[PDB]
């Protein structure tokens, strides 16, 4: 009876440090994982923002480059006239 | 706007429809012009999986449709893919319906009668326009250009004809119209693209390949000096970066496949180049008009876009041509929609208002209307 | 559930008085005072079933202007009628629809603010210009001051 | 033959709602009374007609919210 | 105003919407009958002969018909107004909708319902 | 709930069955799929011994009994035992009639044509449901995703198949099913356990191991800077206390067992790992795709849930892949229940309510029903 | 005493399920803590990578503008020579 009572005794103890433990688990993953949703979103707009700067870069380049064809042509011809 | 009435300005084109409301600069909707039905099973259920994809919307989900032209050289040859061509472009991209607006179409000239009197029995009789007239697609590119004369050479992606025109007045004996245009060349590039290791098959793939050669292709001014060059240094090769990654480097492509034109032996073809058949053109008018011919050589349409073509051209008709006379190649920048650039143009004239084919005059006479005094 | 929330926010003597019962009998193991997360569960599993947490958590903290685990005022209230779905979103689809292209004066689609604000005059309700911004921003989901179709069912949902 | 088809369709567009006509073996009262149906018929198809068009711009004007709507979204 | 109040606000604000929406059809319903008056105009039955009354009568049919014509067309239109407006409200669920499952939870009770699930017949307010 | 009529979302798997009603967020009962006979012979007169013990019954008299799993791959070797597995589910875990709720199997890809028929001439004649359905395992588990194209992973405890879909049209021809599953990693798992002394034999042991594996092991980063650490430290040796005490301790088994997953060499296999076949299943696919089946790589079934799966089958791919696409790989926390979570979505929609083989459709065409237009 | 072990036996068991559970919690909190210091640490990336590309687009605007300039005179220049 002495040793059965010392057993629940200490077994409550620690249950209830468990469930607490426990608690405190639950709440910072649901902090946790509501910040990382947050976060992964914010990194997706800045992905799209970054890919639709680049392709208006990438057409900037294609015109910029003919139009500077066309000018040496043009320069080439010009001294053929003179 | 407001009251009155706006034309239609349609181009059907082959590769690239291009409309607007007359009277604008720029066609309001453009996109390419292919339907494709879905290939493979589909699992998903209530995905909302339509039967056919059109337009701009078929070139994104075109990894699982079988795209198919609906034009193949100027011609016609599937009519109902056409007429959802044209119900789309009238619905969805204008969002006007066509029993208020008449509507002028172009087409190629040496085409089959029947292609035109069956475009025009749709349009009166399908969409109901109140009147259509039908315009050949050099005149056009003609008007844009500020003219009223020059020759004009209007290679498109479907078939590359050469009108010549004085004062006005066409010369109905000297056109020359070869069907090397820009999907051939999509084609041979493709087939020379496999001399690396790159093969595209798939007919979505061919345009990735059609991608590469707007973005990388040029006319080379010198065709044997810059095969030696491509074959010493390394200065041409240009990368470019496939829809997933594995970069690909063409070498000595970039400027072959373009050459076709000047060289239809390349594809087989027997004709002669591009640079040989204005100058034959030009010969068949009388003599006293090839001055102003030779000083008025215009460029039109989409495959005239290569860098570097208005020189080569203009070396390889001076070339030809007599020494005294002064070769001009007017090559706008505005080239890829300067034929509806002139249709908008020819919309917009007074003096045009009594040319429409009305529709009670179809009812009295039928189809055939078309190749009567309203051509 | 559409006449609960309002009725309860200031409920008279007997379901408040009934809810202050029911935290009164719970002292058969919650005795927390405010309602957090753990009593709140223990509190709903003594009842005899184990329902799902999430609905629970949901009701909890999404609906909260604070979300911390603990129970408000009107977020409980909130609760009540979310067990339910009685608020009929703010009438129904159809009539919603007619009501916008009517309200769509210029007929394009969206609603500006010029026509918006004529029509909030020809409302003639208790008007709260707080409550007017609060409503333009609703209606900027897309940022562009018009509200369209999606947005206006969006701050009309539970419009009774 | 698809376009066989419309052409029969338009053919019996202008045939069926085309009826037969019999009002002159109806005598002059009989005449009266059809020359009244037939006033009465017209009159109901002008008020279907009517309604027909405003029920087509009603359906035109929620095709172009529903339209705006999709922009918006899209 | 209060969170109720400003659902009260928006509620007098569709029912306004609602009394515009209903003089609209009203009026709509009142011009168009004075136009189909302006239209459907009835003639004089008595004084006419034989003859007279059949030409009217041939008249009256091709009116007929070229009306009758007329409203196929209009059917036509309003058949194509569907089937357009139907594909756009298709795509409008396509475009927030399918994806939009919401938590379909067969525990999560009424609070009156699980109340009395609960404790017999305690709950009777909800 | 009340009047109307709820779905059984039932899903057979191999290892643990599922199930529970359509519209709900996780399967109402799930227990593992072993029906154990007693084999010693019993002494005891009146203790009302049965016959058989079968789901979760089973897991807690297994110290007498002799496991036999009914599902060896996927396919079903044992239908008698299936059956009473079945029966077991709609009476006992659920205890709902099966005369009154339609059913909504699920069966992995590339089975034997003779299982789906079976299983539903089963279910239509022995339990007399209204409809039944049978889907694939891996659209479910990419329903549960609020996705409509990816790639996804399944790798249950039976086999490990990778289907991939675009727009919501699969492509049948690259799906690649391997049969490496967990029931090979809890083999390969009690055989290596003997390294260090540990025999594990019986069939019920066999619940042992898995339940360390469960426990213990752990995908590792890079496989040889683990093997070359845990060969020096002692910082990895986890200890774990059997059902009776005498507590082991896993050494470097820790991060071998499950490592067999990406080199199927270690337990003999040919192929190559589940980060190799993923691959080579998309580059299977059309060259237009396959930047959206990079970026929307997902994961499913019980297998991955190891800790630290998901960043070695990453980097594995971005070893493979093209520098320039993004590699993104779903790992959604409810992995173990998402083929259970899109079974009830699915049966939940309202587009999908015509899809069931209705029983009059059975008793017209026969069980071969199931392959015809009703999938 | 045979009672009081008897609960004490049931205490043991849910302590067991307890430690079970606050295990499994920690685990899930360690990893979705890690992925959420890579995401963030991507998004910053991501986002210096769309500073660039924007720096890139005005660059080649006003690169763009010159030539253009220069394609002007240089036409005027022809149309003298003709
Ligand atoms: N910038 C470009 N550079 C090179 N080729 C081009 C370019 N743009 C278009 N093309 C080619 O021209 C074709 C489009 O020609 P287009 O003038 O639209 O034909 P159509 O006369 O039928 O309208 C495309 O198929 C493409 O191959
Ligand atoms: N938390 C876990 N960690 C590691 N492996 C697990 C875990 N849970 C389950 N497994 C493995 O996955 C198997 C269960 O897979 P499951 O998805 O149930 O298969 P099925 O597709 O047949 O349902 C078990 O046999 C076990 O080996
Ligand atoms: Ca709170
Ligand atoms: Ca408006
Ligand atoms: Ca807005
Ligand atoms: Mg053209
Ligand atoms: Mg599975």
Not at chain 3, 40 to 57: D, F, H, I, S, Y
Request: hydrophobic content about 35%.
């Amino acid at each position: 009876a002495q040793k059965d009572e010392e057993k629940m005794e200490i077994q409550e103890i620690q249950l209830k440090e468990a469930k607490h433990i426990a608690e405190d688990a639950d709440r910072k993953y649901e902090e946790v994982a509501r910040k990382l949703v947050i976060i992964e979103s914010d990194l997706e707009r800045a992905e799209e923002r970054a890919e639709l700067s680049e392709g208006k870069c990438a057409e900037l380049e294609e015109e910029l480059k003919t139009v500077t064809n066309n000018l040496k042509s043009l320069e080439a011809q010009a001294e053929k006239y003179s | 706007d407001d009251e009155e009435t706006t034309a239609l300005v349609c181009d059907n084109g082959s590769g690239l429809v291009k409309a607007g409301f007359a009277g604008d600069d720029a066609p309001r909707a453009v996109f390419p012009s292919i339907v494709g039905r879905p290939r493979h099973q589909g699992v998903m259920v209530g995905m909302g999986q339509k039967d056919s994809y059109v337009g701009d919307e078929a070139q994104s989900k075109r990894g699982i449709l079988t795209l198919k032209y609906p034009i193949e050289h100027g011609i016609i040859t599937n009519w109902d893919d056409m007429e959802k061509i044209w119900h789309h472009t009238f619905y969805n991209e204008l969002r006007v319906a066509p029993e208020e607006h008449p509507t002028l179409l172009t087409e190629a000239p040496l085409n089959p009668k029947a292609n035109r009197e069956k475009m025009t029995q749709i349009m009166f009789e399908t969409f109901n326009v109140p009147a259509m007239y039908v315009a050949i697609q050099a005149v056009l590119s003609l008007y844009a250009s500020g003219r009223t004369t020059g020759i004009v050479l209007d290679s498109g992606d479907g078939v590359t004809h050469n009108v010549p025109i004085y004062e006005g007045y066409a010369l109905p004996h000297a056109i020359m119209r070869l069907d090397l245009a820009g999907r051939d060349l999509t084609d041979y590039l493709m087939k020379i693209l496999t001399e690396r290791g790159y093969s595209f098959v798939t007919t979505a793939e061919r345009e990735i390949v059609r991608d590469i050669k707007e973005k990388l292709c040029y006319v080379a001014l010198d065709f044997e000096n810059e095969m030696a060059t491509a074959a010493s240094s390394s200065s041409l090769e240009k990368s470019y970066e496939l829809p997933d990654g594995q970069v690909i480097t063409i070498g000595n492509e970039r400027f072959r496949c373009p050459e076709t034109l000047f060289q239809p032996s390349f594809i087989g073809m027997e004709s002669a180049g591009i640079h040989e058949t204005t100058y034959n053109s030009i010969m068949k008018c009388d003599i006293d008009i090839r001055k102003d011919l030779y000083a008025n050589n215009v460029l039109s349409g989409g495959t005239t876009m290569y860098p570097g073509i208005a020189d080569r051209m203009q070396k390889e008709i001076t070339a030809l041509a007599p020494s005294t006379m002064k070769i001009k190649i007017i090559a706008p920048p505005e080239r890829k929609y300067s034929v509806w650039i002139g249709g908008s143009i020819l919309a917009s004239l007074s003096t045009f208002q009594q040319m429409w084919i009305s529709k009670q005059e179809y009812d009295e006479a039928g189809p055939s209307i078309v190749h009567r005094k309203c051509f | 559930d559409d006449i609960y929330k309002a009725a309860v926010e200031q409920l008279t003597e007997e379901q408040k008085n009934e809810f202050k019962a029911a935290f009164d009998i719970f002292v058969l193991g919650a005795e927390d005072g405010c309602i957090s997360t753990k009593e709140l569960g223990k509190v709903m599993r003594m009842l005899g079933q184990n329902p799902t947490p999430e609905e629970l958590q949901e009701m909890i903290d999404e609906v909260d202007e604070d979300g911390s685990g603990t129970v408000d005022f009107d977020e409980f209230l909130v609760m009540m009628v979310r067990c339910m779905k009685d608020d009929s979103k703010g009438k129904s689809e159809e009539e919603l629809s007619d009501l916008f292209r009517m309200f769509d004066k210029n007929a394009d689609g969206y609603i500006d603010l010029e026509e918006l604000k004529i029509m909030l005059q020809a409302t003639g309700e208790t008007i709260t210009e707080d409550d007017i911004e609060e409503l333009m921003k609703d209606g900027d989901k897309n940022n562009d001051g018009r509200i369209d179709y999606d947005e206006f069912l969006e701050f009309m949902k539970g419009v009774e | 033959g698809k376009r066989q088809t419309e052409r029969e369709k338009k053919k019996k567009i202008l045939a069926e709602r085309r009826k037969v006509l019999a009002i002159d073996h109806l005598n002059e009262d009989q005449l009266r009374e059809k020359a009244k149906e037939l006033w009465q018929s017209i009159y109901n198809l002008e008020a279907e007609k009517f309604d027909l068009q405003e029920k087509f711009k009603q359906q035109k004007y929620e095709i172009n919210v529903l339209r705006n709507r999709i922009n918006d979204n899209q | 105003i209060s969170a109720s109040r400003k659902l009260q606000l928006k509620t007098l604000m569709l029912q306004i919407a609602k009394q515009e929406l209903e003089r609209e059809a009203e009026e709509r319903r009142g011009e168009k009958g004075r136009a189909l008056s302006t239209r459907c105009q009835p003639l004089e039955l008595a004084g006419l002969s034989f003859a007279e009354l059949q030409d009217l009568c041939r008249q009256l049919h091709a009116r007929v018909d070229k009306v009758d014509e007329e409203r196929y067309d209009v059917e036509a239109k309003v058949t194509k107004n569907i089937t357009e407006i139907a594909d756009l409200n298709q795509k409008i669920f396509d475009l927030r909708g399918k994806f939009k499952r919401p938590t379909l939870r067969r525990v999560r009770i009424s609070a009156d319902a699980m109340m009395q699930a609960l404790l017999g017949a305690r709950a009777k307010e909800t």
